[PDB]
């Protein structure tokens, strides 16, 4: 292909259907699993 430059995209664009008497309620759900890695020690010199 090639090499290009450009201006980053922060993210999509969501438009919430807000009104003064409307609510959204979930009817289902999922269980999700994520990881987090943290360093605790270093080498003793």
């Amino acid at each position: 292909q090639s090499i290009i430059a450009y201006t980053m995209s922060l993210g999509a664009e969501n438009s919430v259907a807000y009104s003064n008497n409307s609510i959204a309620i979930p009817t289902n759900f999922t269980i999700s699993v994520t990881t987090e890695i943290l360093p605790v020690s270093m080498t003793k010199t």
């Binding site: 980053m8 922060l10 993210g11 919430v16």
Partner: peptide, 28 residues
């Protein structure tokens, strides 16, 4: 600028930061 000293620009402009803040405000 000085004798070998330079200041680098930030990656995010302050317009882009304003767009993160307005998204947090509109979501909330």
């Amino acid at each position: 600028k000085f004798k070998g000293l330079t200041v680098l620009p930030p990656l995010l402009t302050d317009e882009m930061i304003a767009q993160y803040t307005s998204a947090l405000l509109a979501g909330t």
